[PDB]
Amino acid sequence: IIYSVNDKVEYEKALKSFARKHHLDESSFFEAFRKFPPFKSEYGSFSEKAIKKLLPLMRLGKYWNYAEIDKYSRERIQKIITGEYDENIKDKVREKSVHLTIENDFQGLQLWLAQYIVYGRHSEASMIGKWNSANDLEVFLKDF
RNA sequence: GAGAAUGUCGGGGAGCCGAGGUUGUGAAUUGCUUUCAAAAAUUUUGAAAAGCAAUUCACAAUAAGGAUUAUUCCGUUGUGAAAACAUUCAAGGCGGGGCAACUCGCCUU
């Protein structure tokens, strides 16, 4: 509500309607909720869906549970604990995931571990590439 | 070297608006010059028009031009022969926001 409707009259109308639907008295609700500095215009590197897929793995403790890991990452977790051979899992993974013997070991993984398990790439590894003729070059300029 | 996170300093692009200036029209006042045009002693005064103006106000335009009736625009950018582009660009659904137009998120190809 705060982030989306950035217009004054619309803002107090949304605030009053929110205070009506939610059983909270619209007496100090709108007075406290009128003076908000507007959110600083900045956006993160990733999107909502990607971070949604990422967070459950690096959760640990009571805030973590196995059911919140999606189908693909659960399958990859089973593959890692099993130790079987997958084309989408590299040898460096097993090198790093030697401690990931049990499903309980998937608690509090760092950014790189969770990112790889979710999407299978050890960060941005680039593509190197190699042009073969003037055709590639002129295409590159055409697409600039 | 790469990724992410937090601060600092810059640059670029797009957008919503404001005040002048200028050119022209009309008007109020006051001038310079010329001609008509009378009076008076080549010269001085008086009526009219034109040319150029000055101070103030209202208005028209503000790249020549071309659309359109959406409370929308394109016209000083780049590429290059196609006088053709780029700078808006799919479909749904599940939602938040308002008097609603409209605006803002989530999910699947």
Residues engaging strand B (CB under 7 angstroms): A 1, 3-5, 9-10, 13-14, 16-18, 21, 44-49, 52, 111, 115, 123-126
List alpha helices for chain A, DSSP H: 8-21, 29-32, 48-58, 71-82, 91-96, 111-119, 134-142
Torsion, CA A70, CA A64, CA A76, CA A72, rounded to 10: 10
The CA distance from A67 to A134, in Å, is 52
Tokens encoding A118: 């979710």
Method: cryo-EM
The CA distance from A74 to A82, in Å, is 12
Query: Which nt is closest to the CA of A4, judged by C1'?
Result: B104
Task: Report which of A81, A98, A89 is spatially closest to residue A116, judged by C-alpha positions.
Answer: A89
What's the full length of chain A, in residues?
144
Give me the CA A120–C1' B37 separation in Å, rounded.
Answer: 105
Give me the CA A73–C1' B2 separation in Å, rounded.
Answer: 24
Measured over all CA atoms, what is the biggest interatomic distance in chain A, rounded to whole angstroms?
72
For this experimental structure, what is the resolution in angstroms?
2.8
Task: Give A10-38 as a DSSP string.
Answer: HHHHHHHHHHHHTTS-TTTHHHHTS-PPP
